[PDB]
Coordinates of C-alpha atoms in Angstrom, one line a residue:
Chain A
X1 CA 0.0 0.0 0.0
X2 CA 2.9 2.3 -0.7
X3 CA 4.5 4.5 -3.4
X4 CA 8.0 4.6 -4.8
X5 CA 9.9 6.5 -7.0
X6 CA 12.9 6.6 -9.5
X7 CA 15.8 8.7 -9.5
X8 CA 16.9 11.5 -12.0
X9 CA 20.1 14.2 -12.7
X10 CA 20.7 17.3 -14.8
X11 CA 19.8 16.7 -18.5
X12 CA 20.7 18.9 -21.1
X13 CA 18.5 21.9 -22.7
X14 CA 16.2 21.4 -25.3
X15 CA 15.9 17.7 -24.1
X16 CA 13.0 15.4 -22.9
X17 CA 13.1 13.4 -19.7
X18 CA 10.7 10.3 -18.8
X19 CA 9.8 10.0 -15.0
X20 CA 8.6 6.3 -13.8
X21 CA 6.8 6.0 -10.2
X22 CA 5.7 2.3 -8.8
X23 CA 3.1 1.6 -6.8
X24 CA 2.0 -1.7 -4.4
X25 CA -0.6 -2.5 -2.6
X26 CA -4.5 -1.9 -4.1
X27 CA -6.0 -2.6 -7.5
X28 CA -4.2 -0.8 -10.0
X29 CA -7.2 -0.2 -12.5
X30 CA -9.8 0.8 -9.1
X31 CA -7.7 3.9 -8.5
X32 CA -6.8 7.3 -9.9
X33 CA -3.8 9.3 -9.9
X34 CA -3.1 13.2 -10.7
X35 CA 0.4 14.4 -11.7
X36 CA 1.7 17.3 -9.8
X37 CA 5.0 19.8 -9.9
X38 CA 6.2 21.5 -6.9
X39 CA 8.6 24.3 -8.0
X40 CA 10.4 26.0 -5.2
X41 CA 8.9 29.1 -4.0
X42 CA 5.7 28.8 -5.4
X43 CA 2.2 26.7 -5.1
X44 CA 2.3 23.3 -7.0
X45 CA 0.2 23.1 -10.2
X46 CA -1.4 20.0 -10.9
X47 CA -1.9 19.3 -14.9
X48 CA -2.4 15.7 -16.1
X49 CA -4.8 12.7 -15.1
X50 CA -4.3 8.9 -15.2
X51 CA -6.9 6.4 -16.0
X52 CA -5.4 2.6 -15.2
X53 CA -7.0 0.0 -17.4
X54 CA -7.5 1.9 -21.3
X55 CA -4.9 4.5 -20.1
X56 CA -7.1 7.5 -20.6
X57 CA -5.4 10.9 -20.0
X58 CA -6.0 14.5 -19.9
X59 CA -4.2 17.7 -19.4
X60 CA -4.0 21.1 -18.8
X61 CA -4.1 23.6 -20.6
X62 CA -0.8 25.4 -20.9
X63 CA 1.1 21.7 -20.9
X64 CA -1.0 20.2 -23.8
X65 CA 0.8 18.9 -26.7
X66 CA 4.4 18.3 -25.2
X67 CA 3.6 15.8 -22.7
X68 CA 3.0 12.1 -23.7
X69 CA 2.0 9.6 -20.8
X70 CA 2.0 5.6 -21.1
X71 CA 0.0 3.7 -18.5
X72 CA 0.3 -0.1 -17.9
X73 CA -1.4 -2.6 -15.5
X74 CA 1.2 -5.7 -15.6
X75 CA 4.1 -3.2 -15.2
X76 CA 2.5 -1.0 -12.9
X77 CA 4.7 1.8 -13.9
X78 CA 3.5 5.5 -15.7
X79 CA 6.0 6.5 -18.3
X80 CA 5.8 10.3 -17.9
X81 CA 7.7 12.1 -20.6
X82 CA 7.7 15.9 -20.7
X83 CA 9.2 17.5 -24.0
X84 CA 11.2 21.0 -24.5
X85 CA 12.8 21.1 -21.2
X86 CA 14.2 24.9 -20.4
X87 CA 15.3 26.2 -17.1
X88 CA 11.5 27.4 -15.9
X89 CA 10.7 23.5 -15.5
X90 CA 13.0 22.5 -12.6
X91 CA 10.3 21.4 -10.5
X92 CA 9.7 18.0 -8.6
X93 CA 7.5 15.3 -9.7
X94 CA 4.8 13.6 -7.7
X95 CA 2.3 10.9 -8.8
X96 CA -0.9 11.3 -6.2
X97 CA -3.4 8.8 -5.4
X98 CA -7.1 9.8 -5.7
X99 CA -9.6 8.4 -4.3
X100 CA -10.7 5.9 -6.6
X101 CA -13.0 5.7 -9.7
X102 CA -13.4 9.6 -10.1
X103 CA -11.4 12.9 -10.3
X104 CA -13.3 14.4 -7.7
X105 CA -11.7 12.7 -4.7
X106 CA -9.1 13.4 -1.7
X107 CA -5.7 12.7 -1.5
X108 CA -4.0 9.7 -0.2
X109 CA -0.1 9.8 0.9
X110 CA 2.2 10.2 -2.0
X111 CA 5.4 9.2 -2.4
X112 CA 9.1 11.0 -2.7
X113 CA 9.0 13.1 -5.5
X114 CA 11.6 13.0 -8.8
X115 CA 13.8 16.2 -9.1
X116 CA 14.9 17.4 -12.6
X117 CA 17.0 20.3 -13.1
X118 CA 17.6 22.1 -16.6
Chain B
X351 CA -39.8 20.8 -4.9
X352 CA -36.8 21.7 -7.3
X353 CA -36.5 25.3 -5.7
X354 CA -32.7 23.5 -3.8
X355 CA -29.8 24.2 -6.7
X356 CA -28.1 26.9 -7.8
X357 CA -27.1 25.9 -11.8
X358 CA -30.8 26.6 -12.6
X359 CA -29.4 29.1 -14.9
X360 CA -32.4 28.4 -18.0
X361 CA -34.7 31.1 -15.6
X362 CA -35.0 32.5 -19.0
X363 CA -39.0 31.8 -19.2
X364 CA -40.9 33.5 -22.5
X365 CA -44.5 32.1 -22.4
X366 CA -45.2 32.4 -19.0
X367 CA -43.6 34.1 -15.9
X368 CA -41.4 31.7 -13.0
X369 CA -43.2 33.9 -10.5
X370 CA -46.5 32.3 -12.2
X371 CA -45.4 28.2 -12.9
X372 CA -47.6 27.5 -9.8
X373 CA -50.3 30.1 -10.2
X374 CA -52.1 28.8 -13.3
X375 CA -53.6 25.6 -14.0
X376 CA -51.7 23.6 -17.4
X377 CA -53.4 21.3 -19.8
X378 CA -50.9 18.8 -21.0
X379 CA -46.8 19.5 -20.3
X380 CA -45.2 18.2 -22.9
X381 CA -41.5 17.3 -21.8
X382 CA -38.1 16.2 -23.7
X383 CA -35.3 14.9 -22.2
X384 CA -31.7 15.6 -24.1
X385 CA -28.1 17.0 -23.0
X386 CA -27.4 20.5 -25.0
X387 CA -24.0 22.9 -24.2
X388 CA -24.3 25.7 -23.0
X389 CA -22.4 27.3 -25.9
X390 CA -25.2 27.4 -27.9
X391 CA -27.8 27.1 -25.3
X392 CA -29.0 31.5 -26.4
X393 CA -29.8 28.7 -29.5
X394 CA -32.0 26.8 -28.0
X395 CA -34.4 30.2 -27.4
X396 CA -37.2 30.9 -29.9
X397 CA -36.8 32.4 -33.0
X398 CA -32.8 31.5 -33.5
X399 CA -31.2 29.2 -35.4
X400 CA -27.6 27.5 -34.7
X401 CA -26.0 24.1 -36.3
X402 CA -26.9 21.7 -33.8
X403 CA -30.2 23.0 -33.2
X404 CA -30.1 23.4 -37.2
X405 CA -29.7 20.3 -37.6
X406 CA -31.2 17.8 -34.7
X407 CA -34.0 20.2 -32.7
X408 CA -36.1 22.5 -33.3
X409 CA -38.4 25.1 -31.4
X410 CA -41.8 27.2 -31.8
X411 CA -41.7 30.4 -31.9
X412 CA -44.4 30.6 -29.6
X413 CA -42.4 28.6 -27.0
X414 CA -45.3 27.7 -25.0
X415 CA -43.3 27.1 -21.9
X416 CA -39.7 27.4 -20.3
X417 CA -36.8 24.7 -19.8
X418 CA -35.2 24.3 -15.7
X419 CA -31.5 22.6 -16.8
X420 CA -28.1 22.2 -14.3
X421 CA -24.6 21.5 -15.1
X422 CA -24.4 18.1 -17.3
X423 CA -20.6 17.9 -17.3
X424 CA -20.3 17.5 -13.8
X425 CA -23.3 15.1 -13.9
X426 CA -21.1 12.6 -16.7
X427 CA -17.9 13.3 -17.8
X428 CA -14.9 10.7 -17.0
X429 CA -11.3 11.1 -16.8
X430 CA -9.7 10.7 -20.3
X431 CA -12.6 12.5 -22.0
X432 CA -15.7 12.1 -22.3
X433 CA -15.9 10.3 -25.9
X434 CA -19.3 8.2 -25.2
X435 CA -21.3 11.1 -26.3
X436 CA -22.1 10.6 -29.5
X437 CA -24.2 13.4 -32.2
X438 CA -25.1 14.0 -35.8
X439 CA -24.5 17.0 -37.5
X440 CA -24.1 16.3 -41.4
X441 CA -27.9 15.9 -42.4
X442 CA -29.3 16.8 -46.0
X443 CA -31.2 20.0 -44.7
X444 CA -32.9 21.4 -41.9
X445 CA -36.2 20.1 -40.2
X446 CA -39.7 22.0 -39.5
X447 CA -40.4 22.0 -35.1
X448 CA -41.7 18.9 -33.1
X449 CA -40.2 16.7 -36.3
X450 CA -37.5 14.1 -35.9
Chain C
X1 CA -9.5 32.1 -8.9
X2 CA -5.7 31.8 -8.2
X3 CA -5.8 31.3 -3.7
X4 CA -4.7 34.5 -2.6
X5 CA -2.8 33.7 0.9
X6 CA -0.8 36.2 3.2
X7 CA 2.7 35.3 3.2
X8 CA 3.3 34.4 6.4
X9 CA 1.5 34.3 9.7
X10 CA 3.4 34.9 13.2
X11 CA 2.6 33.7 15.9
X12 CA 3.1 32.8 20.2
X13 CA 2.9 29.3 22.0
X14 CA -0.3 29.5 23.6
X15 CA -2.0 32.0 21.1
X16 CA -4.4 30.8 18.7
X17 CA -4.2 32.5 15.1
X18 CA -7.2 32.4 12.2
X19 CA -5.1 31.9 8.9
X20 CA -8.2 32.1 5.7
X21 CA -7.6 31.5 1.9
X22 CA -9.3 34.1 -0.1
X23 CA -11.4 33.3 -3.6
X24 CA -14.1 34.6 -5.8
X25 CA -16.6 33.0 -7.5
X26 CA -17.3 29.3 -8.8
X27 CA -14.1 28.6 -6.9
X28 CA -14.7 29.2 -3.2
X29 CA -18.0 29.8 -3.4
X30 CA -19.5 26.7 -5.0
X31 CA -16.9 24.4 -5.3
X32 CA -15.1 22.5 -1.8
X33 CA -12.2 23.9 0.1
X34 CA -8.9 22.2 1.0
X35 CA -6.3 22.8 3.3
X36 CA -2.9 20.5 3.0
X37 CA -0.1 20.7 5.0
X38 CA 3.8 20.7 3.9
X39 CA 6.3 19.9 6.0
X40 CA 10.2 21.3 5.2
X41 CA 12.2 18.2 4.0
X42 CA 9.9 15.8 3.5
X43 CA 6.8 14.4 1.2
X44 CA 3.5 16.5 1.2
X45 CA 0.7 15.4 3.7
X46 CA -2.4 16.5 4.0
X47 CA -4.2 18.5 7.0
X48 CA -7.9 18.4 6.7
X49 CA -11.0 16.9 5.2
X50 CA -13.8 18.9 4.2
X51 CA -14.4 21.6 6.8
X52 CA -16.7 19.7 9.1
X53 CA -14.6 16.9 11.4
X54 CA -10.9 15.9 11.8
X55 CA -9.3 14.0 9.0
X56 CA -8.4 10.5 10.4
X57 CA -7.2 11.6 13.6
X58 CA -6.0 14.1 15.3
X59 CA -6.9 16.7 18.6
X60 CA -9.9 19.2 18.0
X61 CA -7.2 22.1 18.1
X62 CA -7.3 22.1 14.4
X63 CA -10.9 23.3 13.5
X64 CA -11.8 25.7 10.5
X65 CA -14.9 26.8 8.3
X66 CA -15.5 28.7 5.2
X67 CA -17.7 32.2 4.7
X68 CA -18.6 33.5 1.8
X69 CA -15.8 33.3 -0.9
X70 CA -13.2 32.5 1.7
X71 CA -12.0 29.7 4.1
X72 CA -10.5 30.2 7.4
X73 CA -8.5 27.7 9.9
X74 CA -7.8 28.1 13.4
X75 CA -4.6 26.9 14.7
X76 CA -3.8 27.1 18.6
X77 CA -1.0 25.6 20.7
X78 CA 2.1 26.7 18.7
X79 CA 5.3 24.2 18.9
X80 CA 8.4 24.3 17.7
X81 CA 7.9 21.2 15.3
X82 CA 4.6 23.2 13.9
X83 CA 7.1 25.0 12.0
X84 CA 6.0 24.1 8.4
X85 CA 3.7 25.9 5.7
X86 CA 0.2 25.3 4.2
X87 CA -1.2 25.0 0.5
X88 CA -4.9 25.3 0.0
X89 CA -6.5 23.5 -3.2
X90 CA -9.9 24.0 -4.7
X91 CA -11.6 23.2 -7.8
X92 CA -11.3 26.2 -10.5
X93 CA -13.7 26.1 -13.0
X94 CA -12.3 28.9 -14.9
X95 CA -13.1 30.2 -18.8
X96 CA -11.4 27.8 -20.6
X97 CA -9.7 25.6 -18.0
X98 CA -9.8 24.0 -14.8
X99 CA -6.8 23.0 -13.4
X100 CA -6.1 22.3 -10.2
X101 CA -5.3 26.0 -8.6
X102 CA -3.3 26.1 -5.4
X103 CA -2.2 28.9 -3.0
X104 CA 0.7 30.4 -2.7
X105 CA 3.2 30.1 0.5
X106 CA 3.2 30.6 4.4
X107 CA 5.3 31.0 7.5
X108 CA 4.8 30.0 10.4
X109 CA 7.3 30.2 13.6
Chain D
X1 CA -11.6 58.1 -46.6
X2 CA -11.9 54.8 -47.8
X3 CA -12.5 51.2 -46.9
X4 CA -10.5 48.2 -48.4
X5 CA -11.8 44.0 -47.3
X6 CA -9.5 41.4 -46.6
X7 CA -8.4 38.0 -48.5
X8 CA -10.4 34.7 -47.6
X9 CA -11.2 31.3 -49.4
X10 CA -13.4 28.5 -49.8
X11 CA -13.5 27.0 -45.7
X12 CA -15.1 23.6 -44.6
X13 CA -19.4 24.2 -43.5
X14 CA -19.8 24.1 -40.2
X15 CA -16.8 26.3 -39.0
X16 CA -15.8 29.5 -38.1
X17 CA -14.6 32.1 -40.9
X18 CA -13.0 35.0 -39.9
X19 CA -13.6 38.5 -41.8
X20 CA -12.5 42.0 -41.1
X21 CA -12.4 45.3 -43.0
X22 CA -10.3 48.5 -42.3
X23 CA -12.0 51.8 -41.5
X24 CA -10.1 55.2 -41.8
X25 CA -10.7 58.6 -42.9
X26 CA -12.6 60.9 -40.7
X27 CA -13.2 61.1 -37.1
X28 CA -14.5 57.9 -35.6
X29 CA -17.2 58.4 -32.7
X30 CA -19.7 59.7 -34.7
X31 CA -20.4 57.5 -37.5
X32 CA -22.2 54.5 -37.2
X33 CA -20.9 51.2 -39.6
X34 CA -23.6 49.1 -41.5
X35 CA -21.9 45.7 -42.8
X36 CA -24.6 44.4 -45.9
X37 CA -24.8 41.0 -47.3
X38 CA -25.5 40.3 -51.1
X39 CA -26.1 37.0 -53.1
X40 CA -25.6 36.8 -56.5
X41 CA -28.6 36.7 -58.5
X42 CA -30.4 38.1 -56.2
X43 CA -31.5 41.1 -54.2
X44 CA -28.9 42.2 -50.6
X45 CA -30.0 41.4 -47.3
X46 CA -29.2 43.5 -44.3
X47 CA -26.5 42.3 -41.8
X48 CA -26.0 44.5 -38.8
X49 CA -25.4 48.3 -37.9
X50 CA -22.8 49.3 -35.0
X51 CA -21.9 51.9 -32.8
X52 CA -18.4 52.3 -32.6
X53 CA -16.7 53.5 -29.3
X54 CA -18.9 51.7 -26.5
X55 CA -19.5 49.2 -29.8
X56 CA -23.3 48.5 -29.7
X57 CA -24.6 45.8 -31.9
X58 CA -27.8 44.9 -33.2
X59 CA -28.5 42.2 -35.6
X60 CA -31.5 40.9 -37.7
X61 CA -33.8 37.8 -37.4
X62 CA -32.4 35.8 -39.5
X63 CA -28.9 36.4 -37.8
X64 CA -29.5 36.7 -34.1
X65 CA -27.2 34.7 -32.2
X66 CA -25.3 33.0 -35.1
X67 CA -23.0 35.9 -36.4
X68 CA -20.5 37.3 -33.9
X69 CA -18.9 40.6 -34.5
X70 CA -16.3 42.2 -32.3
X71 CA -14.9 46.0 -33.1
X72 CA -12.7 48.5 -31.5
X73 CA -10.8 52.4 -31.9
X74 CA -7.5 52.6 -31.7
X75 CA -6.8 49.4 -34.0
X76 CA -9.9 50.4 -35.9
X77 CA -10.4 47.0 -37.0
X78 CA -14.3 45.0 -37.2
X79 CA -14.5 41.4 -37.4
X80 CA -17.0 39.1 -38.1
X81 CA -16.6 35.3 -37.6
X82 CA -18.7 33.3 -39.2
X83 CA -20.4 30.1 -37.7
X84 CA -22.6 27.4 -38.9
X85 CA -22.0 28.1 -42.8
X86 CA -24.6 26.8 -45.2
X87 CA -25.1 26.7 -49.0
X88 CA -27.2 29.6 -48.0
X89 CA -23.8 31.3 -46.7
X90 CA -22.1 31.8 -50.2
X91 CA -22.4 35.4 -51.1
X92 CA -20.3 38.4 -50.8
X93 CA -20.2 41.2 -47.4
X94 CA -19.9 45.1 -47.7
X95 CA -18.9 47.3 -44.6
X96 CA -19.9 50.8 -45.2
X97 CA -20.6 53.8 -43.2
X98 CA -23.9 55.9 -41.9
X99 CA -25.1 59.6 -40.9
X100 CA -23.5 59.1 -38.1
X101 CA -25.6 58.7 -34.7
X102 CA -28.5 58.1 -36.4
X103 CA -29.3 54.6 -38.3
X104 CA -32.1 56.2 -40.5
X105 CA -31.1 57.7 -43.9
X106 CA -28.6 57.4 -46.9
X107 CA -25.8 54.3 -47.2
X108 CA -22.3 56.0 -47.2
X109 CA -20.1 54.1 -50.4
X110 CA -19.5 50.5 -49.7
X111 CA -16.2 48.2 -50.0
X112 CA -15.5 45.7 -52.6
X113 CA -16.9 42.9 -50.7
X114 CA -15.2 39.8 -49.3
X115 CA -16.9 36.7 -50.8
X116 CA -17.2 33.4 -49.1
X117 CA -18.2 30.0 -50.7
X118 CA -18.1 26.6 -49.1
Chain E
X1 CA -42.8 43.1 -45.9
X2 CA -41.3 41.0 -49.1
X3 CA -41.4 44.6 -51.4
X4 CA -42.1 42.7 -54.5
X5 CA -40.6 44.0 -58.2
X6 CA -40.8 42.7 -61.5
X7 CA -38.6 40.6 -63.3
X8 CA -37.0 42.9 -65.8
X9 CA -37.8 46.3 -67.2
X10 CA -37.7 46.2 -71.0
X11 CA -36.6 49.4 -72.8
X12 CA -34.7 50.5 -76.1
X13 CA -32.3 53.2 -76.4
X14 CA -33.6 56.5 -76.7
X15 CA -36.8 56.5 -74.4
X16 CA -38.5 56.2 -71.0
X17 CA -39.8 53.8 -69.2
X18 CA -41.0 53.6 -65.7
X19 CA -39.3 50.9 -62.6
X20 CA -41.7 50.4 -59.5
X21 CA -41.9 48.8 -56.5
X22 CA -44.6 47.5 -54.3
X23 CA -44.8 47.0 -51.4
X24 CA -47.5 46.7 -48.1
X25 CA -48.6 48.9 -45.4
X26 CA -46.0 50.8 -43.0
X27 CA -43.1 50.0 -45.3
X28 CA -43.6 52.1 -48.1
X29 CA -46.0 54.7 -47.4
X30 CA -44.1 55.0 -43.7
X31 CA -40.5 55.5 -44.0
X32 CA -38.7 56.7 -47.4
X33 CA -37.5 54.6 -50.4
X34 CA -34.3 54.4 -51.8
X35 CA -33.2 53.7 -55.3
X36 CA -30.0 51.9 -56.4
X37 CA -28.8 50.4 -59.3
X38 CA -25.6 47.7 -60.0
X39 CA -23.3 48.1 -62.5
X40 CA -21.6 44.8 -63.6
X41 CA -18.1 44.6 -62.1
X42 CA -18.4 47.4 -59.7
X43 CA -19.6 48.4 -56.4
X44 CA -22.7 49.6 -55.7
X45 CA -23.6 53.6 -56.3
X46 CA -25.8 55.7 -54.6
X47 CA -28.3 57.7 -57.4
X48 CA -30.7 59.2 -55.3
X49 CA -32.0 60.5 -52.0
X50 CA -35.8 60.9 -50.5
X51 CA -37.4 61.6 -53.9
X52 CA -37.3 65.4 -53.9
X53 CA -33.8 66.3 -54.6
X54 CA -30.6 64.8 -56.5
X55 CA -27.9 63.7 -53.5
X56 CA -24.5 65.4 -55.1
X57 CA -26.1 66.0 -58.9
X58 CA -27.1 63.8 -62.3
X59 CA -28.6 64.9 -65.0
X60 CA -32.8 65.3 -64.0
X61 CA -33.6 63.1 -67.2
X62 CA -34.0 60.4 -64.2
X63 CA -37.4 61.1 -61.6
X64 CA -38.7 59.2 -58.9
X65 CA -42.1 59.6 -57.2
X66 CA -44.4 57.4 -54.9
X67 CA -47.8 56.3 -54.8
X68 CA -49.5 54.9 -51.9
X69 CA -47.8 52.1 -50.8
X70 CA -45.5 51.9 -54.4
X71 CA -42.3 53.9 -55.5
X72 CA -41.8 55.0 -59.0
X73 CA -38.8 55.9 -60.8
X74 CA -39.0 56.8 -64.6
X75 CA -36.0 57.0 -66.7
X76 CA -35.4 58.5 -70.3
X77 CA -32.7 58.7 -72.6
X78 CA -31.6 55.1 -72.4
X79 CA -28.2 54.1 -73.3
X80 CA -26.3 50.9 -73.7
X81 CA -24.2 52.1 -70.7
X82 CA -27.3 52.0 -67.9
X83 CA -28.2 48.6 -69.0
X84 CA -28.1 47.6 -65.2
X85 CA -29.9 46.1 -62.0
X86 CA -32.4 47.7 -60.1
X87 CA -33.0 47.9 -56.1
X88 CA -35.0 49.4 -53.9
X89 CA -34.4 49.9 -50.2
X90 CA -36.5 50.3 -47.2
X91 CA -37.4 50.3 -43.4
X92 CA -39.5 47.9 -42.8
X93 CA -40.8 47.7 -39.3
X94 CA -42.5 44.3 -39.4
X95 CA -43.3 41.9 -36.8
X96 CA -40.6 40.4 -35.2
X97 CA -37.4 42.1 -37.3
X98 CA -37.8 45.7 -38.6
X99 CA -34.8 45.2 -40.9
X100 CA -33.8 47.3 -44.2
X101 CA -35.3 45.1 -46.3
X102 CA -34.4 45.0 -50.3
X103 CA -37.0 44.4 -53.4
X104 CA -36.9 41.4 -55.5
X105 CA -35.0 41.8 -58.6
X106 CA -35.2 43.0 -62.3
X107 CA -32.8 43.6 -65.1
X108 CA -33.1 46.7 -67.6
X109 CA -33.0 45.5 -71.4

C-alpha cells in the first residue's frame, strides 16, 4: 500500500526526460492518480490525469501537446515524458493517489518526488 | 420541490412568468429529455437558429413554456474525456419543429 | 481564482491564530475547500478533510470553516515542530480551464 | 476616406470564418458602420449596424445569435466570424458607413466585398 | 414586408420607361424609399436620396415619385451604358425584425 519513485540528474537543454513512479498495494485499475510539480517558492500546479486499465489521460491547458503519458497494469509503472525542457521547469515530480473511480476525490499519501533540473 | 440548486441558470421563461409556474392551472406538459452545451444554449431560445439546433431540434416560436437545466458535465464526464457522447451533425437539410 | 494567501503568519505558544484563503466565484463559493499541510524536507501530507470533522485523527485544536468566498482555519497551541507551511486546493472552474489552482506560500514560527 | 476587405477562401461548412475590414478617414465616434450582405442573383439582405466606441450591436432575425462581431478604436479593426456556414452562406459582405448617430437615412459608399463560398 | 418588383424592365435606347416597386402597409407609405442600381463589375452607387432632390447631382432626365404604398422611378434617354440592375431599399418595421429590407430583382434590357 505504498508508493516509490525513480531517480533523475541534470539533462541537457532542449531535451525530454521520462519520469517512472511504482506503486503496491491496491488494485491498480480501481484507483486514480493526478500528476503534480512543486517548484520551489511557489504553489504546486497539478496538470495531467491517469486512467489505469484503457490508459485515458487529460491535461491542462498550458502543458497540452508536449507531454506524452504511457499507462500499464502488468508493469504497474507511468511513463511520464515531458518534451522541451528549459530552465522554468525544474520542479519535482509527484504521482498522487485519488480516491478511486473519479477525479473528484481526496488525496492519499504520495510518495518521494523525482527532481529534474535544466 | 426543485426550488434546492443553484445551476438553474435556464430562468430565461418567454410564455409564461417563473413567479406564475404555480399560479395557473396547465393542460398537458409536454416534456423532452436531451443534454445541450451551453455554448449554444441562447440557440435553443425561440426564434434562432444555430447548427446543432439546425440540424437535430427545433423550437416554436411561440415557446409555450420554459426549460429548468443544471450543469451536465459534472453530472457525466470521466477522466480521459468524455468520448461516449455521440451526435449527428451532417444531415441533408434542416427540419420543421416537433419533427425528428 | 488563483488562492490568494498572506505570506506568512506569526505567531506565540499558547496564542491561537485564524489563517483564511481568499477566492471569488465558482471557486470558493461553490466548489469544496482544501487545506494540505507541507512539512520542510519531506513528502506532502495533508491537513484536513472537508471543513466539518478531523481527518483520520487528530486533537480538535485544528478546527476551520469557510464564509462567503473565503476559508478560514484556526490553529492554537504553537510548537516548535509546527514549524512548516500550508497550500490550500480547490476546484477552478475557470473560462477555458480547470486545473487544479493552489495557494501560494506561508510561515509559520 | 476609404474602406479596403481582406483575403479569404473557400472553408469547410460548419466552422468558423474569420472577416475584417479596415475603416479610416474621418473622425470615428460619430459615424455608425452598417456591414450588408449580397447574393448573386439576387437582391442584398441586411447584416448589422454598429456603434463604434462603446460598440453597440444589433443584428436581424435571421442572424441573431449565429453571427459574432467584435470592433474596437485605436486598431480600428471589425470582425465578423462566421459560424454554422450553409449553402445559404455563399455570397459576398460590404462594410460601409452611416449619418452618423443616427441609423435612418442614406448608405455612405460601400467596399469591394469579401466573398465566401463553401 | 417582401417589397415585390418585377422581373425585368424592357426598354430601347432612346426613351422612357418607368421601374416600380410595391410594397404593403408601414413599409412604403411610412418610411422613405431608396433607389439603387448595379453596375456589372463594380460596387454599388448611390443615385438618389428621398425623392425630392438629387444627392451630389445627375442629370434630371431620371425622376422618382411614390404612390401609396409603391415607388416609381421613370427613366429617359436610355443608353447601352445604364443597362443595369435595379434595387430598392426600405425600413421595414414588421413583426418580429424591422430590418432594411431590399425588393426582389429586375434587369433593364
Amino acid at each position: 500500500v505504498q508508493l516509490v519513485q525513480s531517480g533523475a540528474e541534470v539533462k541537457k537543454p532542449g531535451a525530454s526526460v521520462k519520469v517512472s513512479c511504482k506503486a503496491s498495494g491496491y488494485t491498480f485499475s480501481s484507483y486514480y492518480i493526478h500528476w503534480v510539480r512543486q517548484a520551489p517558492g511557489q504553489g504546486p500546479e497539478w496538470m495531467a490525469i491517469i486512467n489505469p486499465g484503457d490508459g485515458g489521460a487529460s491535461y491542462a491547458q498550458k502543458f497540452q501537446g508536449r507531454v506524452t503519458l504511457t499507462r500499464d497494469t502488468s508493469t504497474s509503472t507511468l511513463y511520464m515524458e515531458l518534451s522541451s525542457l528549459r530552465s522554468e521547469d525544474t520542479a519535482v515530480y509527484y504521482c498522487a493517489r485519488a480516491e478511486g473511480s473519479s477525479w473528484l476525490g481526496w488525496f492519499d499519501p504520495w510518495g518521494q518526488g523525482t527532481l529534474v533540473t535544466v | 420541490v426543485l426550488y434546492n440548486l443553484a445551476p438553474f441558470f435556464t430562468f430565461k421563461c418567454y410564455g409564461v412568468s417563473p413567479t406564475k409556474l404555480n399560479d395557473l392551472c396547465f393542460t398537458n406538459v409536454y416534456a423532452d429529455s436531451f443534454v445541450i452545451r451551453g455554448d449554444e444554449v441562447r440557440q435553443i431560445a425561440p426564434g434562432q437558429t444555430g447548427n446543432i439546433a439546425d440540424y437535430n431540434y427545433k423550437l416554436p416560436d411561440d415557446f409555450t413554456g420554459c426549460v429548468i437545466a443544471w450543469n451536465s458535465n459534472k453530472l457525466d464526464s470521466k477522466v480521459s474525456g468524455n468520448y461516449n457522447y455521440l451526435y449527428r451533425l451532417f444531415r441533408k437539410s434542416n427540419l420543421k419543429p416537433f419533427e425528428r | 481564482s488563483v488562492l490568494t494567501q498572506p505570506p506568512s503568519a506569526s505567531g506565540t505558544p499558547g496564542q491561537r491564530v485564524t489563517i483564511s484563503c481568499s477566492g471569488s466565484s465558482s471557486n470558493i463559493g461553490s466548489n469544496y475547500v482544501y487545506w494540505y499541510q507541507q512539512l520542510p524536507g519531506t513528502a506532502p501530507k495533508l491537513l484536513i478533510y472537508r471543513n466539518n470533522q478531523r481527518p483520520s485523527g487528530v486533537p480538535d485544536r485544528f478546527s476551520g470553516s469557510r464564509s462567503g468566498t473565503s476559508a478560514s482555519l484556526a490553529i492554537s497551541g504553537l510548537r516548535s515542530e509546527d514549524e512548516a507551511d500550508y497550500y490550500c486546493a480547490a476546484w477552478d472552474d475557470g473560462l477555458s480551464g480547470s486545473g487544479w489552482v493552489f495557494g501560494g506560500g506561508t510561515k509559520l514560527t
